[PDB]
């Protein structure tokens, strides 16, 4: 049975490269519009993450699927750093300084999915994609730092740090297993 794809693609959704520039409900700066409905792509990705890591086949159907794939790949990086922390007030700083850290984008060495991701066509699109991915990273880390840390002992719950070894289709934004 197929994995969990995103259902946010709209015919009037704009594209960056070949990824749906989906609106996001956040406070950080970025080129994505602001969301009024109660669910953006990041909430959907955090909702589908725990199930999408067990599947081993993921058919890219539209561009919103590519955005959700990126966010699912980045939650696995957030978890690796949140596993080490021991206080939500430190998890937030770690997530901020990780979102700031520039990760490879489509069309550069180190990005795991150059084959199925259209690189930018010029410099302006490159800059817009960089800013968009940075905003996505920042808001995903911000939202996830409130899920990983449970208020009973204020340290990463073992129900979220057990997915550190689980890689989404064995791909990752970091090095090959490092």
């Amino acid at each position: 049975m197929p994995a969990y794809h995103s259902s946010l693609m709209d015919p009037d959704t704009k594209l960056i490269g070949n990824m749906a520039l989906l609106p996001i409900r956040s406070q950080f700066k970025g080129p994505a519009p602001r969301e009024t409905k109660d669910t953006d792509i990041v909430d959907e990705a955090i909702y589908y993450f725990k199930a999408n890591v067990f599947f081993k086949n993921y058919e890219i159907k539209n561009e919103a699927d590519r955005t959700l794939i990126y966010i699912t790949l980045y939650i696995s990086e957030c978890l690796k750093k949140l596993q080490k922390c021991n206080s939500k007030s430190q998890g937030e700083k770690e997530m901020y300084t990780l979102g700031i850290t520039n990760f490879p984008i489509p069309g550069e060495p180190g990005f795991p999915l150059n084959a199925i991701y259209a690189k930018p066509a010029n410099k302006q699109e490159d800059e817009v994609m960089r800013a968009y991915l940075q905003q996505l990273r920042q808001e995903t880390g911000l939202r996830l730092c409130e899920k990983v840390f449970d208020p009973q002992n204020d340290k990463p719950s073992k129900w979220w740090t057990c997915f550190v070894k689980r890689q989404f289709m064995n791909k990752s934004l970091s090095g090959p297993g490092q």
Binding site: K29, K93, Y96, T97, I100
Partner: protein
């Protein structure tokens, strides 16, 4: 995004500007002048005290005091006045809309940092602030990530080594010999020629004489013998009243005190021996990079021939195998402030600011934790 204020605020001159630029906005002598006579004409304007360039303009009828001495703030009222003149008049910006990155020399009384952050938070109500060491900012501005920074400002001198970004606080050296002591020494040695400068107004004249005619001798005793043999080093300075004076032998006898503090009756070693001792206090595996990446900064390192003199001295001290280099960028006079901008403009810095919330929670004693 909103800009961030960077106020170097070293003793001697205050450099202030916005984070992100390549040069300080307002540079003014960090002095405070107060009149010592009574006004007899009404309607021309009589103010209690002038600050900055206005004090230098009217230095005739004023007595000038420095709020900062040897890197330490010794008069807090005048210091608040300096900061007020910096915020409202020289920068034309309110403090409640910008973070402030102050600088201060290492190994200072911690009460200095405490009162600095207390004044910046309670009096001006800034949103956030940070306190940085001047040598680290110089190393930032030099583009490097390793090396030893030999900073020598108007009031204090300090050498700080850093390797791969890991500062070694157990080898940081501080020497109180600096520009103002050299200015006093010049005022003292000018007496032999017959020129007598006593008042605090003429000390600025002496300082200008120093920073216009002094130069570091490559070989001291040889320059002394040369000046004694012939009159070919003598230069003439034009006093602001119309007189002229000639100095040939003091030109290098003044900065030489940096390398032989015994002239000022101090026991400490020169600046070259200070840098060498700072290097030799570090681990044996990092001394080569420190040798190859010596960096100068501060105003007092603008003398002609200081780089070559320090290179010759350290080469005489260091083993013959090691390679010595004295990086002396021509903008080192402002280098510290430059680094400040490079520190506050980074995107990986907005988590190290001392937020107003943190101050209200933990008192002024938080600067000793949130700052190195």
């Amino acid at each position: 995004d909103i800009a961030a204020l960077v106020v170097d605020n070293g003793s001697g001159m205050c450099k202030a500007g916005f984070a992100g630029d390549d040069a300080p906005r307002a540079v003014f002598p960090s002095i405070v002048g107060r009149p010592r006579h009574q006004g007899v004409m009404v309607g021309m304007g009589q103010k209690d005290s002038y600050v900055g360039d206005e004090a230098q303009s009217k230095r005739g009828i004023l007595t000038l005091k420095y709020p900062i001495e040897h890197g330490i703030v010794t008069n807090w009222d005048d210091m608040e006045k300096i900061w007020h003149h910096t915020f409202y008049n020289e920068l034309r910006v309110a403090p409640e809309e910008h973070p402030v990155l102050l600088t201060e020399a290492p190994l200072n009384p911690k009460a200095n940092r405490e009162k600095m952050t207390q004044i910046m938070f309670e009096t001006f109500n800034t949103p956030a602030m940070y306190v940085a060491i001047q040598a680290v900012l110089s190393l930032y501005a030099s583009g490097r990530t390793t090396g030893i920074v030999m900073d020598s400002g108007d009031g204090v001198t300090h050498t700080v080594p850093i390797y791969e970004g890991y500062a070694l606080p157990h080898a940081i050296l501080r020497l109180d010999l600096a520009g103002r002591d050299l200015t006093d020494y010049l005022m003292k040695i000018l007496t032999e020629r017959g020129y007598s400068f006593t008042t605090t107004a003429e000390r600025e004249i002496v300082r200008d004489i120093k920073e216009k005619l002094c130069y570091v001798a490559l070989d001291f005793e040889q320059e002394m013998a040369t000046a004694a043999s012939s009159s070919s080093l003598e230069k003439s300075y034009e006093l602001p009243d119309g007189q002229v004076i000639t100095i040939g032998n003091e030109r290098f006898r003044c900065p030489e005190a940096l390398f032989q503090p015994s002239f000022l009756g101090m026991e400490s070693c020169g600046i070259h021996e200070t840098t060498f001792n700072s290097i030799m206090k570090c681990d044996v595996d990092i001394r080569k990079d420190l040798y190859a990446n010596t960096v100068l900064s501060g105003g007092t390192t603008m003398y002609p021939g200081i780089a070559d003199r320090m290179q010759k001295e350290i080469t005489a001290l260091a083993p013959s195998t090691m390679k010595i280099k004295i990086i002396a960028p021509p903008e080192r006079k402002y280098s510290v402030w430059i680094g400040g901008s490079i520190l506050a403009s980074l995107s990986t810095f907005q988590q190290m600011w001392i937020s107003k919330q943190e101050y209200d929670e933990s008192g002024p004693s938080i600067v000793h934790r949130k700052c190195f």
